[PDB]
């Protein structure tokens, strides 16, 4: 893996803000996109754009094949057994809302127990707020430890054979704790419940298989993994998504249409209302050809490298504090004492360096934490050490100089 | 308006599909983009991406007043009073399900009507059947004229003061009908009824006012009118946005969170759950762009003088069924005689023709016709008579092929 080539691919990178060449460490709020990514929208709608499923004429036909194609790289992308189980959504939030839609609300009564953990992202918390609302059921929280893991003994105190519904995330986008998933989907059918993974921080940077994690649901986001805005996956059990209604109705997820009453298609498209996010998933799929070529393994083993020399050279730093495990994904949320982290972001975009400040979509999380708002750096394949230098030097200038104000 | 500047902008028109020119006249599935769409994705991407709404770094902020400025181009595109009334969404298919969801199944009881016609697209019957049976209220067609259009007599009859819902389509996908929304918009109000229309077919392809159509709703697709896949708008009068509560709940559209309780943005961000469709929505403003800088009359002329060319063409042809009025959009939908519109299609696209051959996602409407299929060219700002030509010429050829067979 040369990181020089990989960088080289990936036009955005090569410019300056404020005079000083890019630094783009902001990879968990949105990922960076490969000329193959960009070149497969262009090529779409140069050469093929039309509608789908139809199948009358040549480009309807190029269409259909370059969606359903993109299907089955996803499938076997997270080892899926049936592109039954692969539904194109808008992005995690809604292949989320789908599962707490059709699944929670249509099997929740009170008694019933949603589990969750307090360093969820909203996206996997609001749903199932209004889900155990609708039903009368009961939301809990599995707690953290000290270093904001989990721990499995925790896990079998929360769940109980009330238990419903267990939903987790992967990877955390603030902590970059690494969670336990397959034991918690153990735990969570030993219980009698089904396990949703929250897998948008995840799937971007490591090797998914949801054969072995054994979870039901398992959402992810195309943007955050080198492929296109406005388009998701909600992976499921095959056995479920038969047993679950639409969460949207209209064309194409139809069968047969009378005056009152609809018959709905077999999986998937029982799931997709609507003319689909055609030119979308096509560049999920071109994203996923990509990633795959480079491998997983060493997209995460790069990580590995870029997080534990990060924390070393945050830990060379006075006045920092960084949240989270020592054994994480590639990111580091932080504060600087006495800097406010909008400030530290403000001072760091002057330098050309891109981070991102405030809950993170962790509101429970910061309180939790007991503060009102971090900075945090998130890397990619495309990032290097000479770019976290950068980061841990511009943070020494940014101590210095709100040292000087006062 | 300079047609061949116009298809000079399509790189996509400029290919052969089985040795002969592509004639593609199919623009109500989709529609083909102009260089300045796809450029504009390609400008997003290559350039200033990045996650929005946090505005701390540089490439941040452009990706936000990309994604805003997009917001403000659609609310003078469709002459809205305020951006708290442009909601973005996947598509008009979701669009729709929303007022569905938010606010059909909040405001309906038993005892209460919805109000459709027969010759709707699936995308503006299922969502009402599925909120009409979750409330136990009632749901009524208006019939239609044997021309296919509607009589205000026949909607005053069907809209009575139980009326909570009229939905409605501004623009036949099938007939090519422009329907009396205005009109129904005072019928609709004289009951007490809040009007839905479904925008889809006509906002490609005519200006739209909804001051002046005084639609409750209004719903549209952006793959329908040169811009990106996966994109559409709901627009919404703002009081009644502000009363119904969110379709989809995550991140983006909360203010506080808490353990078992959140509080909303205002709007729109109240509808708009996660990170947002980035590069699509700017991709549409792009499109709004050009169809403003060529001219919605001046694209809706063009229409009218190739329907006029079609219709006329059309009836110079023996065994030859056309239906819907003489008054319409820029499409025919039509049978052969003894020949099964599949295999119309078929044929058409071994010259080069592409057309649409099946229900249309009218189930209803071609039970209506007393046909279980039918064929339809559909037209936009890129097609030419000369194309009609050619398609009639095919036809003609289609019938005599058919008759040497038998
Ligand atoms: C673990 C996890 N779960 C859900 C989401 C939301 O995904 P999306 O915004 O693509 O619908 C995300 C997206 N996270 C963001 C998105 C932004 N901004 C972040 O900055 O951390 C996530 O990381
Ligand atoms: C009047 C009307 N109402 C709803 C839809 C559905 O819009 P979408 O598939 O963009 O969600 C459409 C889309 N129509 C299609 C889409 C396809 N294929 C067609 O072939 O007529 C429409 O024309």
Redesign the pocket.
């Known amino acids: 893996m040369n990181i020089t080539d990989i960088r080289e691919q990936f036009p955005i990178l090569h410019q300056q803000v404020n005079g000083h060449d890019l630094v783009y460490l902001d990879s968990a709020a949105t990922s960076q996109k490969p000329r193959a990514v960009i070149e497969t929208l262009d090529k779409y709608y140069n050469q093929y754009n039309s509608?789908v499923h139809?199948g009358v004429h040549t480009l309807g036909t190029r269409a259909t094949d370059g969606y359903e194609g993109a299907r089955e790289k996803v499938r076997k992308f997270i080892n899926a057994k049936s592109m039954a189980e692969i539904i194109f959504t808008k992005g995690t939030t809604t292949s989320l809302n789908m599962v707490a839609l059709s699944y929670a609300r249509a099997n929740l009564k009170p008694g019933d127990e949603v589990v969750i953990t307090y360093m969820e992202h909203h996206a996997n918390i609001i749903p199932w707020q209004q889900a155990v609302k609708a039903t009368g059921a009961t939301l809990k929280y599995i707690p953290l430890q000290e270093d904001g893991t989990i721990s499995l003994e925790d896990v079998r105190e929360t769940v109980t054979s009330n238990t419903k519904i267990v939903a987790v995330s992967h990877v955390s986008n603030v902590l970059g704790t690494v969670n336990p998933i397959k034991e918690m989907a153990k735990i969570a059918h030993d219980n009698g419940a089904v396990i949703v993974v929250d897998g948008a921080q995840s799937t971007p940077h490591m090797k998914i298989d949801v054969q072995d994690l054994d979870c039901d649901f398992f959402a992810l986001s195309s943007h955050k993994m080198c492929g296109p805005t406005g388009v998701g996956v909600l992976y499921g059990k095959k056995a479920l998504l038969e047993n679950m209604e639409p969460a949207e109705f209209?064309?194409?997820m139809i069968d047969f249409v009378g005056l009152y009453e609809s018959t709905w298609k077999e999986l998937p498209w029982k799931f997709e209302?609507?003319?689909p996010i055609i030119a979308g998933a096509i560049g999920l799929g071109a994203a996923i050809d990509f990633l795959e070529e480079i491998g997983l393994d060493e997209i995460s083993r790069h990580e590995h490298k870029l997080a534990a020399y990060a924390l070393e050279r945050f830990r060379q730093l006075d006045g920092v504090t960084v949240y989270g495990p020592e054994e994480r994904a590639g990111l580091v949320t932080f504060n600087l004492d006495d800097v406010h982290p909008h400030d530290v972001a403000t001072v760091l975009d002057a330098e050309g360096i891109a981070v991102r400040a405030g809950h993170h979509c962790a509101q429970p999380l910061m309180k939790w934490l007991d503060v009102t708002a971090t900075a945090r750096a998130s890397f990619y394949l495309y990032n290097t050490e000479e770019e976290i230098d950068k980061l841990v030097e511009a943070l020494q200038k940014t101590k210095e100089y709100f040292t000087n104000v006062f």
């Open positions: 509608n139809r209209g064309g194409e209302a609507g003319t």
